Amino acid sequence: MDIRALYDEKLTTPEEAVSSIASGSHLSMGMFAAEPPALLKALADRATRGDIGDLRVYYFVTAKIAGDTILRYELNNRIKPYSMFVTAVERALIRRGIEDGGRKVVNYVPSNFHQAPRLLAEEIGIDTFMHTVSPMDCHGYFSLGVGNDYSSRIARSARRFIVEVNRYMPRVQGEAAAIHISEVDAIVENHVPLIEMPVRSAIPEYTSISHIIADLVPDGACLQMGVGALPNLVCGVLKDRNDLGIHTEVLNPGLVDLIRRGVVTNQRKTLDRGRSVFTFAMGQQEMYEYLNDHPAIFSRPVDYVNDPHIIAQNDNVVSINATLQIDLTGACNSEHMLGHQYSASGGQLDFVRGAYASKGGRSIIATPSTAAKGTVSRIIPRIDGPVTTPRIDTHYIVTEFGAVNLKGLSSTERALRIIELAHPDFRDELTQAAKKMHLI
Numbered sequence: 001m002d003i004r005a006l007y008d009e010k011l012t013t014p015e016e017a018v019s020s021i022a023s024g025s026h027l028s029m030g031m032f033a034a035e036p037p038a039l040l041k042a043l044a045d046r047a048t049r050g051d052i053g054d055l056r057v058y059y060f061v062t063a064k065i066a067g068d069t070i071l072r073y074e075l076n077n078r079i080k081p082y083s084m085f086v087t088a089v090e091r092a093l094i095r096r097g098i099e100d101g102g103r104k105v106v107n108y109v110p111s112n113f114h115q116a117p118r119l120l121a122e123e124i125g126i127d128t129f130m131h132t133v134s135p136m137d138c139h140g141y142f143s144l145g146v147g148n149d150y151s152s153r154i155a156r157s158a159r160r161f162i163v164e165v166n167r168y169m170p171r172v173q174g175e176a177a178a179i180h181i182s183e184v185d186a187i188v189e190n191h192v193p194l195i196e197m198p199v200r201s202a203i204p205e206y207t208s209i210s211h212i213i214a215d216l217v218p219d220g221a222c223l224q225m226g227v228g229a230l231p232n233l234v235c236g237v238l239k240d241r242n243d244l245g246i247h248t249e250v251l252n253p254g255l256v257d258l259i260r261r262g263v264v265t266n267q268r269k270t271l272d273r274g275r276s277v278f279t280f281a282m283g284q285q286e287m288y289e290y291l292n293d294h295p296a297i298f299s300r301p302v303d304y305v306n307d308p309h310i311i312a313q314n315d316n317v318v319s320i321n322a323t324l325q326i327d328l329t330g331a332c333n334s335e336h337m338l339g340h341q342y343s344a345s346g347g348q349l350d351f352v353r354g355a356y357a358s359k360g361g362r363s364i365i366a367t368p369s370t371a372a373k374g375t376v377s378r379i380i381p382r383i384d385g386p387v388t389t390p391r392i393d394t395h396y397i398v399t400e401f402g403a404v405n406l407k408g409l410s411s412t413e414r415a416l417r418i419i420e421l422a423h424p425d426f427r428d429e430l431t432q433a434a435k436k437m438h439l440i
Contacts, residue, residue, distance in 0.1 A: 001181075005018060035065040047078040053315075056082045065195060086420070129155055144299070234254065315359045316360040318355065320366065401420065
């Protein structure tokens with residue numbers, strides 16, 4: 001194929017690239033750092049000029065990029081967020097919609113992340129897909145870079161695929177990560193640094209927690225970690241380990257550090273031996289650079305990564321996830337918003353199940369015992385409404401005061417052992433509550 005010719009007959013401006021997108025259609029985009037700033041700004045401008053309406057945008061993990069363009073509150077009447085996972089950007093929109101006469105401005109779409117490819121391709125249907133990509137190579141291929149997730153599927157199943165070439169986007173190897181230019185409908189170029197996950201400082205509780213978790217990581221553990229200061233600290237403690245593998249949902253700076261140190265070899269994995277596996281990546285510039293052309297890092301779609309049966313096929317999986325609350329039944333809650341559950345959509349539960357099913361595997365859910373300078377307990381009597389991790393799935397829980405394996409324990413054994421993980425200031429109160437609920 002004459003790729004140079006193909007590039008030039010597809011290359012165009014952001015404004016022109018989004019101008020044929022139909023009103024009343026379905027659009028989706030890449031996660032996080034794969035959200036295309038130039039294309040989304042141009043699309044936002046269309047809505048501003050009143051040149052498009054009734055556009056549903058389906059997506060999972062959003063950033064300032066979409067937040068400052070197509071998802072601005074003012075465009076809400078023309079570009080409709082159909083969020084399948086609610087983060088801070090949606091929290092602000094929903095809050096503001098309540099203020100503004102009780103408007104519903106975010107349309108939550110309950111879903112399983114590991115089913116995202118199918119859900120978007122078949123149940124929902126996507127007309128236009130937009131994604132930042134690495135520059136075309138000499139064979140005519142782009143790469144989805146920090147993204148695979150649902151994106152490697154929808155880039156093919158969507159009726160139109162528009163790419164935003166960025167040199168700051170790493171060239172990443174992975175299943176269906178490479179896209180030939182013949183599979184692309186339009187191209188724009190916008191070379192800008194990828195947005196970064198803000199680094200958060202550790203709190204004192206994370207020191208004890210990270211050491212308790214470290215003792216629970218066996219030899220040749222196959223790691224999955226969410227983002228945050230706690231996981232990063234844990235990786236810090238694992239810097240003296242050997243022959244660890246990676247099979248994670250999110251690839252973060254902590255895990256990449258273990259790769260760079262040679263702690264991670266993936267030689268004890270059954271699947272994807274010799275390669276670290278992820279579905280999408282979040283970090284800072286240094287991590288993003290490191291991913292470029294890395295031969296031992298291999299992205300795969302979320303329907304592989306987050307499939308509990310796939311996760312379970314590696315021995316000694318250790319899944320480390322954070323949560324905001326744990327109740328006395330062992331149910332856990334990761335959703336910030338009061339009265340609601342939009343967090344259940346996330347792939348956390350997939351690894352809770354997968355890690356337990358792994359031979360030698362451990363699912364860990366960890367949290368500091370208190371919040372707000374010790375005045376609020378994160379160990380509570382009962383979670384309000386639907387939960388993030390049901391009590392029948394929870395394996396290990398950790399606070400700064402220890403760990404408990406809940407599997408096989410009665411309601412009473414659970415409550416008595418969970419209370420001992422609460423801060424001393426709250427254990428009496430939790431004990432009374434447990435009695436009232438007739439757990440003990």
